[PDB]
Amino acid sequence: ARRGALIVLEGVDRAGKSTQSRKLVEALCAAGHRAELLRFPERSTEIGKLLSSYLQKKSDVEDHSVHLLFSANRWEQVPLIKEKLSQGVTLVVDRYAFSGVAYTGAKENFSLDWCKQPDVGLPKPDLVLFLQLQLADAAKRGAFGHERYENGAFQERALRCFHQLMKDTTLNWKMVDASKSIEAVHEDIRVLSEDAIATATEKPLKELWK
Amino acid sequence: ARRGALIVLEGVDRAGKSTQSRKLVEALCAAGHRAELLRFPERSTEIGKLLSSYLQKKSDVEDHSVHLLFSANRWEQVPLIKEKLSQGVTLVVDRYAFSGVAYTGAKENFSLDWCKQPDVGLPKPDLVLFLQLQLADAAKRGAFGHERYENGAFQERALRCFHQLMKDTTLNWKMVDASKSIEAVHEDIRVLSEDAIATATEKPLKELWK
Ligand SMILES: Nc1ncnc2c1ncn2[C@@H]1O[C@H](COP(=O)(O)OP(=O)(O)O)[C@@H](O)[C@H]1O
Numbered sequence: 001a002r003r004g005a006l007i008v009l010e011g012v013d014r015a016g017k018s019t020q021s022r023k024l025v026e027a028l029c030a031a032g033h034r035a036e037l038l039r040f041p042e043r044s045t046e047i048g049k050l051l052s053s054y055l056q057k058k059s060d061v062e063d064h065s066v067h068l069l070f071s072a073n074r075w076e077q078v079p080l081i082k083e084k085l086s087q088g089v090t091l092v093v094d095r096y097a098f099s100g101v102a103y104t105g106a107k108e109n110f111s112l113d114w115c116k117q118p119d120v121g122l123p124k125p126d127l128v129l130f131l132q133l134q135l136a137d138a139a140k141r142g143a144f145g146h147e148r149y150e151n152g153a154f155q156e157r158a159l160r161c162f163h164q165l166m167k168d169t170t171l172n173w174k175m176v177d178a179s180k181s182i183e184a185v186h187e188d189i190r191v192l193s194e195d196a197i198a199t200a201t202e203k204p205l206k207e208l209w210k
Numbered sequence: 211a212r213r214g215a216l217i218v219l220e221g222v223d224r225a226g227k228s229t230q231s232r233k234l235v236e237a238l239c240a241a242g243h244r245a246e247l248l249r250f251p252e253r254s255t256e257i258g259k260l261l262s263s264y265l266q267k268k269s270d271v272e273d274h275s276v277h278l279l280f281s282a283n284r285w286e287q288v289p290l291i292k293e294k295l296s297q298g299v300t301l302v303v304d305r306y307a308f309s310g311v312a313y314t315g316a317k318e319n320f321s322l323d324w325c326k327q328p329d330v331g332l333p334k335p336d337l338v339l340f341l342q343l344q345l346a347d348a349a350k351r352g353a354f355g356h357e358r359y360e361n362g363a364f365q366e367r368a369l370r371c372f373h374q375l376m377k378d379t380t381l382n383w384k385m386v387d388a389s390k391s392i393e394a395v396h397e398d399i400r401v402l403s404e405d406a407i408a409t410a411t412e413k414p415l416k417e418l419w420k
Pocket residue numbers: 011012013014015016017018019020141142178179180181182185
């Protein structure tokens with residue numbers, strides 16, 4: 001059976017990830033692909049609830065612990081991800097391990113190396129779209145929410161960490177100009193996704209960062 | 211202020227860790243030290259409950275996720291551990307990161323390296339007592355419990371992983387002949403502990419595996 005592709009959308013807050021992930025799944029399904037939507041954090045699980053409470057500031061969680069919970073929250077979906085891909089379903093994922101490293105990396109004394117380790121071995125995305133736009137342009141998209149990390153200084157530090165990660169050529173990173181209109185960004189992402197879905201059927205799923 | 215020592219007790223199931231940890235705290239306090247008892251997993255926290263449910267077989271947890279939860283369960287106590295040690299309190303800990311690596315390492319496809327990473331940077335123990343005894347002798351101490359890992363094949367594989375870890379000379383590992391009587395084992399551990407408490411006041415707390 002021809003496997004589905006694992007496509008991840010990354011970027012800072014308000015980059016358009018959730019909008020574009022939803023629209024990409026809709027468009028791929030309308031074009032005859034079997035595509036499904038996933039997101040991280042997956043706030044529905046027991047770990048997910050801990051993470052949601054933390055992000056809402058309803059609880060405080062030690063920084064290393066929360067970093068590990070974010071990773072554990074990905075691992076608990078790995079059996080499902082592998083099964084779906086093997087069944088031929090393409091998975092469009094709103095955030096993945098890259099957000100995990102970039103957001104914890106925005107905290108002092110968290111090396112990129114330590115942050116990556118827990119996620120070493122996850123299913124490696126076939127395509128990582130980075131929805132690029134200036135933080136000042138993202139800032140024009142209404143106001144910051146009230147969750148943790150939703151402030152200018154944290155986003156700036158997370159973006160710099162994403163830039164560091166984009167130096168890993170082991171991954172198929174594709175820059176997307178996320179400053180355009182919702183429909184224009186969508187078309188760019190959809191074309192990239194269709195190419196990746198066709199090529200993913202030619203090579204086995206690999207392991208991230210290993 | 212003269213810091214307390216961080217003393218960890220490790221070993222296979224039924225090696226006497228919990229008995230000896232309790233008795234060591236009692237004896238140190240009776241000798242005028244400020245010593246407190248800790249254990250991992252710390253089953254009282256939100257993460258701890260997840261871990262307890264898993265160990266009781268009330269739930270299944272993906273292996274990488276549970277490994278990370280075990281580590282997160284240590285990290286969430288790090289601020290407390292650091293504060294207590296700095297206040298001069300010696301902490302006697304029933305299991306730590308070594309058990310975390312040895313038990314997950316008993317599962318195929320879990321490298322020692324990947325298992326160590328989440329715990330890299332925890333407070334480094336001043337003394338790691340390994341309560342050594344043949345698994346066949348441990349087996350004579352009543353019957354195996356009903357929790358996960360409480361069977362001969364898993365314990366054998368975990369012991370082999372502990373042997374691998376004991377090759378790290380970066381740690382002050384001390385072998386204890388845990389086959390002796392409760393009181394004899396206790397005296398050996400108590401003498402080792404008193405020496406370590408005196409020397410811990412001379413050097414700062416370090417970071418594990420880094
Ligand atoms: N291309 C775009 N131009 C303008 N506003 C946009 C664009 N894409 C999304 N938005 C709006 O910006 C906000 C953030 O979009 P969202 O998709 O939720 O981003 P993210 O998940 O990256 O935070 C929402 O109000 C959304 O409607």
